């Protein structure tokens, strides 16, 4: 019950083509531009309290000990998205970004709508280098500017690090959005109704993107409860190590596990993202 | 910021001598039980798909699991289900449930209300040996039967094994519980605005009683909205192992966290229940 | 499809002998005291804004005009919550309110929770007339605060007097207690799990507690929607003019349409709740 | 250092010939409508805390206790707002301020501005009952409406009982009415620049009536700080027992003691009120 | 966003109606009457310190170069204020003063306060050449003395020049009036509560009627802190270039800005105050 | 909600470790010296102007007795504070300040800033006792003069006897230093920021240490408006008698209070400043 | 009137032997650094408005362009104080830090208190590049935490980049600063009565530190306002062109002008603060 890569391009392309196809891209995406984990970067900032980065990290979770500095010393958890933005989208970063076969071949397609969940700027920076315009999609405010239809509309998910009060980071937070309340949720909401969504970069054990994977399900199940059952669109999800209990799981939350190349995990990535093209 | 035995106990016996405190059961009250695990229950079940029992626990969580045999195999999820009521309620359960200080100290106490998470008698049981009442509240036609003021309702907030159907053991079924609308969520809805919790059994890498945590600190702010806040009742955490960093997380969420003794994890809780005395 | 005197009174006699009857009270229970309507106190004080009460009436519903006033001279809505209080809650009301056999015939049966819509302090002061305690329960700190378990607990559904921010009486007020948020609602998702109810002094154009009947139904069939489908308690609403249409749209909400002698309104009123005892 | 009731006239009928005499009137211009005390309606409030009254009095002043109120049961504290409505503004007290010859010496003077302290609505009723119209003045609202250069404007500088929000009553509300940043404290700002104040029903030990004393003459002088020093305006305390030592403090504040008859009080307060006429 | 002559006629006349609009003159009213500007005068007095008039100009604004003068030779500030009364108050700026049609205007309506800030007496006598009579508010001396209720009250908002140690010329003077201590500040706290504002003859480039423009919006959110947000009054600034940016900075100080027509300035202003009338 | 002695000891400790605990010292501290009261002082004082002393003392409190001598009769103000300044100074004052427990224990430990209320030497006194270097800081020119960091500074908050037009104790100097201008004020201003409080000898009917805990919270509550709220530092009051409302009363001014024992006043607190070590 | 290199440098050093030298750094301590000018930055913010960049310059002032962001288009603000995040904070900008004799030569000398007005982190990082240690204190949090006393603490007087709530750059910002009631402000109110203030990097046509200057010498009137008038410490103002009229109006506001050389700007400040040394 796992798709290839030949056998999901002529059904990523068949949704393309119709314009049918948005990529829900997580932080795996951004795994060859070398940034900072986060959790190093919490740890360090937590020397200041008296704790040693081995024994902080042993607390609980990143989103747990974020809760920490929200609660207990709030200056530092500014402190942690203002050196996450220095960090994330430095010169460095992009000039990973200008080489980086995953993000050149995500650009090379005309796409309507790209969803991410990462802080940093390199979704929309990579369609800057193909020479395309891309609207960034965070607050209400965002929503409320003008633009072109021609233009790709990409959607934070969960923030920009140029609007720091729609970071999605403190535990407190993730926990408020499990209500589907913010304009990206409300985005979400419409969007599921027509289209197919290519989910790249996540973990089976993310326990954040399996409930908007269920609820996403819930939300077209509910979507037909009185007129008779129609099939609706697949999703997908690219994979490198797929398991085997995991895409039995997926399937009955209308998502196709694609298992990839685990041998390089970046070239492979963007073999798929070219056979859609 | 964390409360002794001896600290506490003035505290919780002004909730309880005007009725205002309701005991939160977990699965840690029944671990003198010496009840089977569960996920060893569901590793057994898998050699019949093919699975070596350490194999088959490594690819995902004991809910997921249960997700995998609830759509694949569904005779085994009901055979699940029924070795489970065959062994947390055999009749080598009841005899350590007698001789527990534990249940003995839980019921030498007239509660009102009795939350519970586990899917065993001995909570009921443990009231039935005393000579007490209990009424056991898991569906909707046991709120539709009548009852005496006197008895102590113990709500079955993830169901009872006599009734299967109520059971939420799956992933989907917990996911579907975060959006409170079952019978023992409703009444979970009312009781928050007049109680203070004593949540006993838990770990803080739960990740369902920490929504449940979250969900209940907002509830109490949504319901003081329009008028001037008030101070509400605190509700308590009683912990064998605190940390460092999650009871100060637990504060902002209305919950005062007890470090009981480590050394013997059994009596330190008794010590606590018979301090309310 | 409709119940007369007799045939309704062994009916609600079995609800009340084992303590599942809750009533919901109307503001046609307080008409026997001569109160001011409201539309005409509303009409009054529009004459410092230039309009005449004749012609201020016509521009929207009651509920319609609060708003006006909540917006545009918000005096003069704290004006209005200010002398409702001193009207409705006179020394001449209390003493219609003694002398009335529907206040009488009430408080001579030992409820455990009244339910009322209508601001006055008649519901409760009619239980203090008969050497009975009762509990009024409008917002937060009035749930948080001690009471025994005697004592009836009379809930107000829209506010208290006394509590001038409980008010449920603008049209936006309206609007968002459809969505049940307040205490007051939360108590109301917990006892239709277990009682019936008594709508009494409503009319069927009101459009607010139509909303209200239609949502505990739809409450009682989702909190069944997994197990299989048990048959609930009825819901009696007691009329003196039923109709031909509305008692059969009433009963798929789970409620049973009382018909009560028209010819006088008071006294068949207080033949039903003496027939309860 | 004190003047008599015939010294008194002729200068308070100067400053009324101009229009520059403003009333200030205190709680005991309110005393011949027998109202309650307030200190004892808090304290029969506090029966259901477990207080009695005669010890509930004992642990500090009237706003310190209601300071108590606001943040340990705050719907105790809307409560005896409640009360005071009932009770400050009822039909005896009315049938009292139709004979009362304070309140119709008062209501005889065609005044263009009357300073009130208590929240009752005894001031411009008294001017209702002379033909007379009066425009209430205690939020931002009533001074945004419009109005009539004849209407006099009654300034509630404690708040008014149908504006509950407005009520200066809580301990921790006197003491931020001292930075003089209400409404009706901007008012008494620019009044104090042209007029002469006539204070009538306070005591000596008011310690809050003494810093609106002083602070009055703070801001005479810091009004001519680089002009020469000019004489301003005597302001006036109409006294039944003026002491000793405290008519020459109030000398250097700018205000004149007058000596009132103590045999009677009431009629001694209006021979003051008509003299001037 | 930006009223035109025939939008906003509507506006100020219905607040004119109702007693509740102050204009707020500034140096632009004056500019028909070809008065000397006084950074020529301070320029001219400077040759007997040793300076050239446009070297004297450059070392700083003109409020800086009468700080100058006030600590180096007052001798000289004194002569400044003696030869701005024999220019600003010559009898050739009465004669054109006469025959404006912003003066008459001006007069031909029946105003209750008018601000202004320029030192001249133009504003007065633009009322007593239409045969109406003014009162002039510039010091403690002028409040403080008797006047009737139809005589419209000028406050000098910087003093008059028959009063010279009234004047606001000194930049330390200005820098303590941002205070708001002084008698015509006091009164400008008291009118804000009630009125709508006219201001006419400022540039957006001024930086001390911005502080104003601020100042009094601070006021008025500071004024309805506790009670609900009401609607206030518009105060209005009439413009002959409104420029781009700066009106959207003015809308949420509360003011809204008139585009007058450009090409004749004086007659532009004169069809702004008839179609009040 | 009061702590104990054992109870407040690892919280004082906690924030004297960390160098961010001021003492705040009243009258109750120069108890056990055996002063004269002050209100005897000044009623021996007033048999020269036709008073007896119990009469005198009959019209008003202490300041406000004062205020009379500051107005009627000046040279008995300063002959006031110069046998003050004989009496609280005395040889025999310093005699029972080297044996004093409560001088000791205070001077035992290495504070940074010690506030106190009193005008005699015996705070800095009893650090001079211990061998430490202590600089009293009362006038501007103490401000100004220089010195080391490792000297404790005492700051007089209502002045020095050794600096006579420093003192605070006429009535109208108590209102002037409610606006917080004084150098001992100003210094408050910045200290409240970073630091907790001590405060040790006061009374809960004292009106002018009132304002002061409120006006404390007021300014770390203005203090962070614009970014979130954090948590403030707890302040402290040890008191032998605390009641039973006042202390609910303070904990919203962030001030705990500390029950010491009544029997021996000096001993605990002397118990108090040594747990703090 | 205008001091020189070698006459101030005797004057400094007696100030900083003693403790008592604060320096205030402006803008133009940050110019070696090669920054954007922000001016340039917010005009290129402008082109999504449709705004050529020469024409947005047009319309006012750099913080009421700022304004218009902060109204108009929210998005625009905190994407402006992200980018300048990014260049004031660059490694590039670090790099010119490490080599700048300024910035040698401020950290060279043990200060304990130094003020600076912009918001980037050369000030502290300065400090860091000498191995000394330093406190950034910008928010209530930041006083708050723990701190050694041999530590220098740097307030940062209008914000820093890493903490974006504390930035004070729009204009509505500017003029809620001039109340004086911000953490650095209160900081400030204290320290000007102990210390000497040198200003570096300023104009004179500031218009916002030229009110700080008038407002320090107004709190040091006001500081000794009873007390016999004592001299202060002089402040200091280094400036390259100082002018003909300016240091004569800074020399009443207890500020003395120091000429630098203005061939080589960088080197001039950095031998003034060698001589220091």
């Known amino acids: ?21 948005i990529p829900f891209l997580g932080a795996g995406f951004s795994k060859p531009l070398k940034l900072p984990d986060g959790s190093q970067l919490i740890a360090s900032l937590a020397k200041t309290l008296g704790f040693e980065p081995e024994l902080f990290d042993m607390h609980g979770r990143f989103e747990q000990l974020a809760e920490f500095f929200a609660i207990s010393a709030p200056n530092r958890l500014q402190r942690l998205v203002y050196e996450m933005s220095l960090s994330f989208d430095s010169a460095e970063a992009e000039a990973l970004r200008e080489k980086s076969p995953m993000h050149r071949a995500l650009a090379a397609l005309d796409w309507r709508t790209i969803y991410t969940t990462n802080y940093d700027k390199h979704v929309e920076g990579a369609l800057r280098d193909a020479g395309k315009q891309a609207a960034v999609l965070a607050s209400f405010a965002d929503f409320q500017g003008p633009r072109a239809r021609d233009v790709c509309e990409v959607i934070k998910f969960h923030g ?21 309340d913010a304009p990206p949720d409300q985005r979400l909401r419409a969007d599921l109704l027509a289209n197919s969504f290519l989910f790249i970069g996540y973990s089976f054990s993310d326990t954040n993107i399996r409930y908007i994977w269920y609820r996403m399900n819930q939300l077209r199940e509910q979507s037909q409860l009185g007129v008779k059952h129609s099939q609706a669109r697949r999703c997908f999800f690219a994979t490198h190590g797929a398991g085997l209990v995991q895409p039995d799981i997926l399937q009955q939350w209308n998502i196709d596990v694609i298992q990839l190349d685990p041998t390089d995990k970046s070239a492979s990535v963007a073999r798929l993202l070219e056979s859609i093209a």
């Open 1 to 21: 019950t796992t798709l290839t890569l030949s056998e999901a391009a002529p059904l990523l392309k068949k949704e393309f083509r119709e314009g049918r196809l």
């Open 160 to 180: 920009t690090l140029d609007q720091p009060d729609t970071i999605v980071l403190t535990e407190s937070s993730y926990f408020q959005r499990m209500a589907l």
